[PDB]
């Protein structure tokens, strides 16, 4: 028996904001597999269950009688539903998918991962899609003509080292960079000018990253950075110091620590250290580097879905999660808001704070709603005396609340 969200329940939501979030972290390209090969997606796509709402939900299911196994969130992952691989989430808020691949039998140029989730008692959560992933034949000189294979300064990359069991990923934890076998970080790669100096503060530049250029790698999660590096192209076991073409997806790279005696960013098992290169005999535009000094680079992306059971458990899955891209004022006898986005349905209402607004559905990408009168927020106000800002939330008819980061502000005339 589905219940509409009440204003009491909305106010309780708005003061706590204990959402359940599904985060899907993954790379932007994947190399295809030919014949009977399996070339695993790397870094492995990762599902994170973020937000205090997961613990809250678990406590609710167990109060109502469920065992630990029945309240355990479960997830399966697959590629464009063309069969899914089970992930293991027990004891952790995340799981990685380490054996996904795509066969050339699949003709798609692009695809999305599908993550299907439910609780151990088989209560449905839903299906969550990753961002678009581009199939490539293999890594490439490469031209700037194909910017999807290039790497813009200020975008995020993952970095991994292979000695398939040996694979480790650059990652930050416990206040240090390390080479993890379980998790991978996403790092901003910023271009710096050749004559910019080391420091906690530094100036970054726009443009596509080229070998030979000076870069800063900054953890997107912790904000910590490595020293200035010169990114260099790797051939088998050597750094090429004269290479200057664009860095491309899934290229092997080396990172020379600028202003050192041939020291390169290197792993020693889980440890990140610097390790001195060996100068080459007759080819002095080359240096020989440790096997732990070679890193594969790839651009990353993420999808994020946020929901909350405003009136307790529901029968239907919470997906497809509606997403608001933009709000625009709109004009008549009273003001109206045009919502643009994705996965809208006729059973959604826009709420302004704890006030449910009249809401019209046009199609999956467009809703229109009527701005409540200011007196719904401020008792007696016949006009906007002072600015009043309220949150904008989407709510389904069974009480599922979908957080947005949007607000509406009443502004004096």
């Amino acid at each position: 028996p589905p219940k509409r969200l009440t204003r009491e329940a909305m106010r309780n939501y708005l003061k706590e904001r204990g959402d359940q979030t599904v985060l899907i972290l993954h790379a932007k390209v994947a190399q295809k597999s030919y014949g009977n090969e399996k070339r695993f997606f790397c870094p492995p796509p990762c599902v994170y269950l973020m937000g205090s709402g997961w613990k809250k939900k678990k406590e609710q299911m167990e109060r109502d009688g469920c065992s630990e196994q029945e309240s355990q969130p479960c997830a399966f992952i697959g590629i464009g539903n063309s069969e899914m691989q089970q992930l293991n989430l027990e004891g952790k808020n995340y799981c990685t998918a380490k054996t996904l691949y795509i066969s050339d039998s699949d003709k798609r140029k692009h695809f999305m991962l599908s993550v299907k989730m439910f609780y151990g008692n088989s209560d449905d959560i839903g299906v969550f899609l990753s961002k678009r992933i581009k199939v490539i034949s293999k890594p490439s000189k490469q031209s700037l003509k194909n910017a999807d294979l290039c790497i813009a300064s200020g975008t995020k990359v993952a970095l991994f080292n292979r000695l398939t069991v040996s694979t480790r990923y650059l990652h930050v934890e416990g206040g240090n960079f390390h080479a993890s076998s379980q998790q991978w970080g996403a790092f901003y790669i910023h271009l710096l000018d050749d004559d910019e100096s080391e420091g906690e503060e530094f100036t970054v530049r726009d443009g596509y990253i080229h070998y030979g250029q000076t870069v800063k790698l900054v953890c997107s999660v912790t904000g910590m950075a490595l020293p200035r590096l010169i990114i260099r192209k790797v051939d088998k076991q050597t750094a090429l110091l004269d290479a200057d073409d664009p860095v491309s997806q899934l290229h092997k790279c080396a990172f020379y620590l600028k202003d050192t005696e041939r020291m390169y960013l290197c792993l020693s098992q889980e440890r990140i250290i610097q390790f001195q290169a060996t100068p080459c005999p007759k080819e002095q535009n080359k240096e020989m580097i440790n096997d732990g000094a070679s890193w594969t680079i790839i651009s990353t992306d993420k999808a994020e879905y946020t929901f909350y059971e405003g009136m307790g458990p529901v029968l239907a899955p919470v997906t497809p999660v509606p997403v608001v891209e933009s709000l625009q004022l709109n004009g008549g006898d009273v003001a109206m808001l045009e919502l643009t986005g994705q996965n809208f349905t006729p059973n959604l209402r826009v709420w302004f704070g704890d006030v449910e607004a009249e809401t019209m559905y046009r199609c999956g990408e467009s809703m229109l709603c009527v701005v409540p009168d200011i007196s719904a927020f401020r008792e007696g106000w016949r006009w906007v005396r002072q600015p009043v800002q309220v949150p904008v939330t989407l709510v389904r008819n069974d009480g599922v609340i979908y957080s947005t980061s949007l607000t509406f502000t009443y502004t004096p005339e």
Binding site: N176, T203, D206, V218, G223, M224, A225, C266, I273
Partner: peptide
């Protein structure tokens, strides 16, 4: 544009 950023530095230790 060109932008001024802040990031805590972490320098890798020399090999043992």
């Amino acid at each position: 544009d060109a932008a001024k950023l802040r990031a805590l530095l972490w320098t890798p230790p020399p090999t043992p």
